[PDB]
């Protein structure tokens, strides 16, 4: 038989029963497929920083030990 082949009727209402949900907004979007080269540089930097931190910690420990 012939049909109500399309309607956007009530759709808005349906949507608004659980609100138009926003994205949750996370502080750290993945840098997965984004700017290469730069991001590897960043990674390297981070690693360096971590190493430095670790060294500092080690030094502190040594000091504590005497």
């Amino acid at each position: 038989a012939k049909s109500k082949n399309h309607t956007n009727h009530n759709q808005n209402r349906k949507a608004h029963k659980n609100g138009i949900k926003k994205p949750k907004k996370h502080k750290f979007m993945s840098r997965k497929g984004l700017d290469p080269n730069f991001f590897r540089n960043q990674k390297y930097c981070l690693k360096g920083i971590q190493k430095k931190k670790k060294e500092l910690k080690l030094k502190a420990k040594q000091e504590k030990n005497n």
Binding site: Q11, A15, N18, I20, K21, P23, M29, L34, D35
Partner: protein, 155 residues
């Protein structure tokens, strides 16, 4: 039936009257950073990097910058939920939005005001006071300059 990538664009992407040509060479010097808000305004003089019909006019945060590209996090309302769309565009289309800069200016001014307040220790109310009701006044008008009014007859 016919939902191609440039449908309903007879006017969206038509360059405005006496502004054909191309994007001016100074538009390529707009500085962008990972966090800048950014309008997407499809200059259809460049056919590369043309973002979809829908994102024309819609602002978004820059999440990625490239050789001549800009990824833009733009919201799209999709039936029951807004979702983040990563619109990869050329620079010709991406324009730096101005909303954020209004806020920025205010911030700057507010800092100065705060400093001033601290200089003297005072409770300055920063927050923008919206258009409230008007206070009492006493308006001098001569009886000469008060033009009386009646409705108009029909013609």
């Amino acid at each position: 039936k016919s939902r191609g990538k440039r449908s309903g664009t007879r006017y969206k992407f038509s360059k405005k009257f006496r502004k054909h040509g191309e994007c001016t060479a100074n538009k390529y010097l707009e500085k962008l950073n990972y966090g800048d808000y950014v309008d997407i305004v499809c200059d259809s003089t460049q056919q590369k990097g043309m973002p979809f019909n829908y994102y024309h006019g819609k602002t978004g945060k820059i999440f990625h910058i490239t050789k001549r590209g800009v990824g833009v996090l733009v919201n799209k309302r999709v039936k029951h939920r807004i979702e983040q769309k990563k619109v990869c565009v050329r620079i010709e289309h991406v324009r730096k939005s101005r909303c954020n800069e209004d806020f920025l200016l205010r911030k700057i001014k507010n800092a100065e005001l705060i400093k001033e307040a601290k200089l003297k220790n005072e409770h300055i109310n920063i927050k923008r006071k919206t258009e409230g009701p008007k206070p009492a006044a006493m308006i001098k008008v001569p009886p000469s300059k008060i033009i009386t009014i009646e409705p108009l007859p029909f013609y």
